[PDB]
Design an enzyme around this catalytic site. Structure first.
Site, PDB file in Angstrom:
ATOM      1  CG  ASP A  66       7.185  49.752   2.557  1.00  0.00           C
ATOM      2  OD1 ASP A  66       6.497  49.434   1.610  1.00  0.00           O
ATOM      3  OD2 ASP A  66       8.037  49.041   3.039  1.00  0.00           O
ATOM      4  CG  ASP A  73       5.950  47.700  -2.114  1.00  0.00           C
ATOM      5  OD1 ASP A  73       5.996  48.560  -1.176  1.00  0.00           O
ATOM      6  OD2 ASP A  73       6.924  47.250  -2.440  1.00  0.00           O
TER       7      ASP A  73
HETATM    8  C1  LIG Z   1      11.358  54.694  -2.415  1.00  0.00           C
HETATM    9  C2  LIG Z   1      12.758  54.071  -2.645  1.00  0.00           C
HETATM   10  N1  LIG Z   1      12.769  53.514  -3.874  1.00  0.00           N
HETATM   11  C3  LIG Z   1      12.646  52.333  -4.061  1.00  0.00           C
HETATM   12  C4  LIG Z   1      12.278  51.346  -3.087  1.00  0.00           C
HETATM   13  C5  LIG Z   1      12.491  49.907  -2.966  1.00  0.00           C
HETATM   14  C6  LIG Z   1      12.245  48.932  -1.873  1.00  0.00           C
HETATM   15  O1  LIG Z   1      12.757  47.930  -1.820  1.00  0.00           O
HETATM   16  N2  LIG Z   1      11.210  49.503  -0.985  1.00  0.00           N
HETATM   17  C7  LIG Z   1      11.042  48.763   0.159  1.00  0.00           C
HETATM   18  C8  LIG Z   1      10.879  50.035   1.125  1.00  0.00           C
HETATM   19  C9  LIG Z   1      11.868  50.832   1.141  1.00  0.00           C
HETATM   20  C10 LIG Z   1      11.869  52.238   1.117  1.00  0.00           C
HETATM   21  C11 LIG Z   1      12.846  53.090   0.880  1.00  0.00           C
HETATM   22  C12 LIG Z   1      13.968  52.874   0.791  1.00  0.00           C
HETATM   23  C13 LIG Z   1      14.538  51.330   1.041  1.00  0.00           C
HETATM   24  C14 LIG Z   1      13.336  50.298   1.039  1.00  0.00           C
HETATM   25  C15 LIG Z   1       9.774  47.968   0.212  1.00  0.00           C
HETATM   26  O2  LIG Z   1       9.312  47.622   1.436  1.00  0.00           O
HETATM   27  C16 LIG Z   1      10.006  46.747  -0.546  1.00  0.00           C
HETATM   28  N3  LIG Z   1       8.750  45.984  -0.693  1.00  0.00           N
HETATM   29  C17 LIG Z   1       8.750  44.515  -1.056  1.00  0.00           C
HETATM   30  C18 LIG Z   1       9.182  44.336  -2.373  1.00  0.00           C
HETATM   31  C19 LIG Z   1       9.963  43.955  -0.125  1.00  0.00           C
HETATM   32  O3  LIG Z   1      10.794  43.556  -0.491  1.00  0.00           O
HETATM   33  N4  LIG Z   1       9.566  43.512   0.902  1.00  0.00           N
HETATM   34  C20 LIG Z   1      10.489  42.856   2.018  1.00  0.00           C
HETATM   35  C21 LIG Z   1      10.285  41.596   2.331  1.00  0.00           C
HETATM   36  C22 LIG Z   1      11.108  40.888   3.166  1.00  0.00           C
HETATM   37  C23 LIG Z   1      10.676  41.473   4.760  1.00  0.00           C
HETATM   38  C24 LIG Z   1      10.788  42.806   4.663  1.00  0.00           C
HETATM   39  C25 LIG Z   1      10.016  43.638   3.651  1.00  0.00           C
HETATM   40  C26 LIG Z   1      12.684  49.301  -4.446  1.00  0.00           C
HETATM   41  C27 LIG Z   1      12.810  50.149  -5.488  1.00  0.00           C
HETATM   42  N5  LIG Z   1      13.043  49.541  -6.608  1.00  0.00           N
HETATM   43  C28 LIG Z   1      13.982  48.559  -6.887  1.00  0.00           C
HETATM   44  C29 LIG Z   1      14.016  48.250  -8.324  1.00  0.00           C
HETATM   45  C30 LIG Z   1      13.130  49.344  -8.856  1.00  0.00           C
HETATM   46  C31 LIG Z   1      12.304  50.028  -7.827  1.00  0.00           C
HETATM   47  O4  LIG Z   1      11.395  50.809  -8.011  1.00  0.00           O
HETATM   48  C32 LIG Z   1      12.809  51.556  -5.232  1.00  0.00           C
END
Ligand SMILES: CCNc1cc(C(=O)N[C@@H](Cc2ccccc2)[C@H](O)CN[C@@H](C)C(=O)NC2CCCCC2)cc(N2CCCC2=O)c1
EC number: 3.4.23.46
Length: 373
Positions: free
Chosen positions: A32, A216
């Site tokens: 990530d 990202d």
């Molecule tokens: C691969 C899974 N699909 C998928 C995952 C995310 C998602 O939120 N990915 C995170 C990792 C993840 C990976 C797997 C499962 C959950 C999260 C990233 O870290 C997000 N990166 C930025 C935008 C963020 O929010 N960083 C934060 C800031 C605050 C401090 C911590 C880091 C978003 C979507 N989205 C959302 C809407 C459209 C899309 O593609 C689809």
């Protein structure tokens, strides 16, 4: 031995094998570039095949501090600690790193994804609870002789490569083009122009970067600021108007399906994102085919057809260049020189008429700074 060290399922992230603890516990860890915390499932969960058992690790050290991390999709809470970490199909080194042991979570772990943890590869500035929690890659570089660079070649089953400490020339063709890392927090970049089938969206370029633009690997879609999203969808609708889709398709609320092998790729346009160059008023472009932004959704129930979700969606927190954009490019995270390089990947997307591309240079007459802040 680092080639083909990533696996995944479409829409569920790409992961690398790692070990944590002494004796080593093997876990699959999502790669990530959009976060900066290293965290692993550390308690039973319905979608976890396995998890980190701190009690079995003699090298585990508890930091006596909890942490909460919210993403766009999902959130978790856990306990901070440190332990020894290795990457079996990476550099043959052992580092002591911060690890968040996830003990509660909501909509984070994905049913059948094959990963149990996440490796935040971005900078300390966005680590939780704050920037004193050193991220994994920083620890790796400080503790080993590994050069301060990594590259990602992202290609239901998927694969690719994460080359740690270098650039593998066998994974790309043509030239590497570099865009500056604007600020070291996210991998923040600047988009200077967007075209849909060569037609400029004709917006003030600051709009493309309202309020930041990031690269990202942990987000699936290309996510665009509302105004940019709406303009882009209008243009893609116009280009594809030989067929008419429900509004829900364009919102990602609904699949589009065609009889197997008949997807009309040629009615959908190419999208070009122009990224700021290393030299004043110069840029280069990466060109995205519909095979990237129409994401296949594998489901044996629907398999008389090929079905897709529209993988461009809206954002209120700036542009996110997600995995759908990175796929078919070789992307170099050159931390040492504060730049991100793009080249056409050995697994690039192309059909018999069109190809994904990275090309330049382009010049703008307009002297405006495209950075939002
Ligand atoms: C691969 C899974 N699909 C998928 C995952 C995310 C998602 O939120 N990915 C995170 C990792 C993840 C990976 C797997 C499962 C959950 C999260 C990233 O870290 C997000 N990166 C930025 C935008 C963020 O929010 N960083 C934060 C800031 C605050 C401090 C911590 C880091 C978003 C979507 N989205 C959302 C809407 C459209 C899309 O593609 C689809």
């Amino acid at each position: 031995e680092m080639v083909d060290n990533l696996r995944g399922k479409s829409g569920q992230g790409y992961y690398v094998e790692m070990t944590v603890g002494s004796p080593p516990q093997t876990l699959n860890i999502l790669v990530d570039t959009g976060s900066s915390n290293f965290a692993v499932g550390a308690a039973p969960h319905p979608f976890l095949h396995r998890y980190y058992q701190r009690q079995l690790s003699s090298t585990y050290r508890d930091l006596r501090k909890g942490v909460y991390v919210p993403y766009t999709q999902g959130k978790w809470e856990g306990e901070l600690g440190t332990d020894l970490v290795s990457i079996p199909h990476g550099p043959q080194v052992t580092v002591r790193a911060n690890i968040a042991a996830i003990t509660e979570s909501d909509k984070f772990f994905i049913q059948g994804s094959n990963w149990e943890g996440i490796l935040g590869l971005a900078y300390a500035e966005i680590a939780r609870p704050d920037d004193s929690l050193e991220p994994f890659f920083d620890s790796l570089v400080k503790q080993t002789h590994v050069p301060n660079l990594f590259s990602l070649q992202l290609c239901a089953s998927v694969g690719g490569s994460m080359i740690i400490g270098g650039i593998d020339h066998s994974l790309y063709t043509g030239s590497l083009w570099y865009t500056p890392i604007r600020r070291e927090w996210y991998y923040e970049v600047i988009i200077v122009r967007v075209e849909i089938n060569g037609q400029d969206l004709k917006m003030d370029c600051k709009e493309y970067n309202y309020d930041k633009s990031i690269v990202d690997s942990g987000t699936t879609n290309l996510r665009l600021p509302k105004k940019v999203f709406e303009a882009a969808v209008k243009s893609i609708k116009a280009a594809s108007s030989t067929e008419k889709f429900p509004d829900g398709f364009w919102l990602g609320e609904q699949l589009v399906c065609w009889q197997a092998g008949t997807t009309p790729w040629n009615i959908f346009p190419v999208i070009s994102l122009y990224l700021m160059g290393e030299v004043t008023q110069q840029s280069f472009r990466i060109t995205i085919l519909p095979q990237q932004y129409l994401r296949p959704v594998e489901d044996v129930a629907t398999s008389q057809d090929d079905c897709y979700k529209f993988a461009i969606s809206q954002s209120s927190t700036g542009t996110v260049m997600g995995a759908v954009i990175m796929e078919g490019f070789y992307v170099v995270f050159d931390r040492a020189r504060k730049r991100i390089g793009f080249a056409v990947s050995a697994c690039h997307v192309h059909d018999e008429f069109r190809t994904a591309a990275v090309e330049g240079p382009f010049v703008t007459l307009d002297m405006e700074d495209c950075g939002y802040n």
